[PDB]
């Protein structure tokens, strides 16, 4: 026997109902724009497999951002392009304005809308309770939208949320790890950064779905309301699950593993041992108490569940009382 199958609880068949050109990114033909329209102004970042510049569109003198794509797996170029084009115009999704060939190496470069960003290591220190709720709701809007469009982001983390706090404007960026959800498909578990990897990634359960993004979101929320960054501070991939188990407890972990017939490494199983669940109240202290409320902890608790089928969907999350007043704000 093998692992038990799983299906997305919501939006399960969205891609099946669309024409195949929507999700068959390998068959996408790229419409290339005019590289001469853009001139690089300065370097903004040099992440993995990509370089990011501030640039100028000289046909309208619009400040834009150019990301030069250099993945090892070339199939991710069309993938990112197709996903950006399918989600274009959606709430809080970064806008792909153009695609051009870098005149140096003929490598693809994406042109994006420019956002007036403020770094999170400078921002999450000054956020009020209300601000945390408001921006979580904006992220949820983006996630419900991309999930409803058949797409899982798979790399939700602070650096991939651009915030113009002066205008209370938020954009979800870097769709280079995003994939289309197809029921029954097995996905790669190497996605996401360690601190934000869901337990399904950490136990090598490959038939995961949109709910992966809901675990990541939970990890961000916990780090903001408790002012512990990252909240689960694993030092390698096994330690990440150990740190999770020390908070959520091993009883629900072992029930999760049994439910889906997941094959755990025996020495790892021995290492996890037995840990009781810690009540969320243990993480409150005088320095973070102004960010904690009963509805915050209930919401957090309903995002950070081992069983991916048990986590709140983005829409259920948007209906949680934690956002009640925020919902009346717009
Ligand atoms: O949490 C945070 C963390 C701040 C991290 C700073 C990263 C600097 C890179 N800077 C931009 N990287 C982009 C990447 C993409 C993409 O890969 O899709 C799309 C758009 C941008 C972008 C747009 N406008 C201004 C700057 C950038 N801040 O709130
Ligand atoms: Cl406790
Ligand atoms: Cl969802």
Are 280 and 161 found together in one domain? yes
Question: Of the residues 173, 175, 196, 230, which should be mutated to test ligand 1's pocket, given the most ligand atoms within 8 Å of the CB?
Answer: 173
β-sheet bridge partners, residue 152? 179
- Domain boundary among the residues 63, 92, 114 is at 114
Are 206 and 262 found together in one domain? yes
Instruction: Compute how many other C-beta atoms are within 10 angstroms of the C-beta atom of residue 165.
Output: 16
13, 219, 294, 303 from 228: Cα distances, Å: 38, 10, 19, 17
Angle formed at CA 140 by CA 26 and CA 206, multiple of 5 degrees: 45
Give domain status of residue 1, yes or no.
no
β-pairing, 179-180 vs 96-101, is: unpaired
Are 107 and 146 found together in one domain? no
Rounded CA gap, 66 and 112, in Å? 6
Structural domain range at position 189: 6-23+115-330
Give domain status of residue 310, yes or no.
yes
SS (H, E, C) 191-242: CCCHHHCCHHHHCCCCCCCCHHHHHHHHHHHHHHHHCCCCCCCCCCHHHHHH
* φ, ψ of residue 132 in degrees (nearest 5): -60, -45
Give domain status of residue 198, yes or no.
yes
Are 53 and 67 found together in one domain? yes
To the question of whether residue 46 is assigned a binding role by annotation, the answer is yes
Resolution (in Å) of the shown entry?
1.9
Name the token pair of 267.
């020495």
Rounded CA gap, 108 and 69, in Å? 6
Contact 111, 99 (CB under 8 A): yes
Give domain status of residue 141, yes or no.
yes
- Number of domain units in the chain: 2
Which residues have C-beta within 8 Å of that of residue 303, sequence separation ≥ 6?
214, 215, 217, 218, 221, 311, 312, 317
Question: Of the residues 45, 47, 52, 79, which should be mutated to test ligand 1's pocket, given the most ligand atoms within 8 Å of the CB?
Answer: 52
Experiment used for this model: X-ray
β-pairing, 161-164 vs 179-180, is: unpaired
Cα–ligand 1 centroid distance for 161 (angstroms): 7
Rounded CA gap, 21 and 29, in Å? 10
Give domain status of residue 318, yes or no.
yes
Are 89 and 47 found together in one domain? yes
Q: Assign 276 to helix, strand or coil.
A: coil
| CATH number for the domain that contains residue 323 | 1.10.510.10
Q: List, by residue number, the catalytic residues.
A: 155
Q: Assign 68 to helix, strand or coil.
A: strand
* φ, ψ of residue 124 in degrees (nearest 5): -70, -5
Which residue has the least CA distance to atom 19 on ligand 1? 173
Name the token pair of 224.
């903001």
β-sheet bridge partners, residue 54? 42, 65
121, 235, 245 from 240: Cα distances, Å: 22, 7, 9
Which residue has the least CA distance to atom 23 on ligand 1? 114
Contact 121, 223 (CB under 8 A): no
CA-114 nearest atom, ligand 1: 24
Rounded CA gap, 251 and 276, in Å? 8
* φ, ψ of residue 210 in degrees (nearest 5): -55, -30
Q: Assign 32 to helix, strand or coil.
A: coil
Give domain status of residue 273, yes or no.
yes
Q: Assign 188 to helix, strand or coil.
A: coil
Can you state the angle between helices 211-226 and 129-148, rounded to 10 degrees?
A: 170
Q: Looking at the CA of 47, which ligand is closest? A: 1
CA proximity to 285, closest of 217, 214, 226, 200: 226
Rounded CA gap, 237 and 200, in Å? 12
Cα–ligand 3 centroid distance for 51 (angstroms): 31
Contact 209, 192 (CB under 8 A): no
């Amino acid at each position: 026997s093998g692992p038990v199958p799983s299906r997305a609880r919501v939006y399960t068949d969205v891609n099946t109902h669309r024409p195949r050109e929507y999700w068959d990114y390998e068959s996408h033909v790229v419409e290339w724009g005019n590289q001469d329209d853009y001139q690089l102004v300065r370097k903004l970042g040099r992440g993995k497999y990509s370089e990011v510049f501030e640039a100028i569109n000289i046909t309208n003198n619009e400040k834009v951002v150019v990301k030069i794509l250099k993945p090892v797996k070339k199939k991710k170029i069309k993938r990112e392009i197709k996903i950006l084009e399918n989600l274009r115009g959606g709430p809080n999704i970064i806008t792909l304005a153009d695609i051009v060939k870098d005149p140096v190496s003929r490598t693809p470069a994406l042109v994006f809308e420019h956002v007036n960003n403020t770094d999170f290591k400078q921002l999450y220190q000054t956020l009020t309770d209300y601000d945390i709720r408001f921006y979580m709701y904006e992220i949820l809007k983006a996630l419900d939208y991309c999930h409803s469009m058949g797409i899982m982001h798979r790399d939700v983390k602070p650096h991939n949320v651009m915030i113009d706090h002066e205008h209370r404007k938020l954009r979800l960026i870097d769709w280079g790890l995003a994939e289309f959800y197809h029921p029954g498909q097995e996905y790669n578990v190497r996605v996401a950064s360690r601190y934000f990897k869901g337990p399904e990634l950490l136990v090598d359960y490959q038939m995961y779905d949109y709910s992966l993004d809901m675990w990541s979101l939970g990890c961000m929320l916990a780090s903001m309301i408790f002012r512990k960054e990252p909240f689960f501070h694993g030092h390698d991939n096994y330690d990440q699950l150990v740190r999770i188990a020390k908070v959520l407890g091993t009883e629900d972990l072992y029930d999760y593993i049994d439910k889906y017939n997941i094959e755990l490494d025996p020495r790892f199983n021995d290492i996890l041992g037995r840990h009781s669940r810690k009540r969320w109240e243990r993480f409150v202290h005088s320095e973070n108490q102004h960010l904690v409320s009963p509805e915050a902890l209930d919401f957090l608790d309903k995002l950070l569940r081992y069983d991916h089928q048990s986590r709140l969907t983005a829409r259920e999350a948007m209906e949680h009382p934690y956002f009640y007043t925020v919902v009346k704000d717009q």
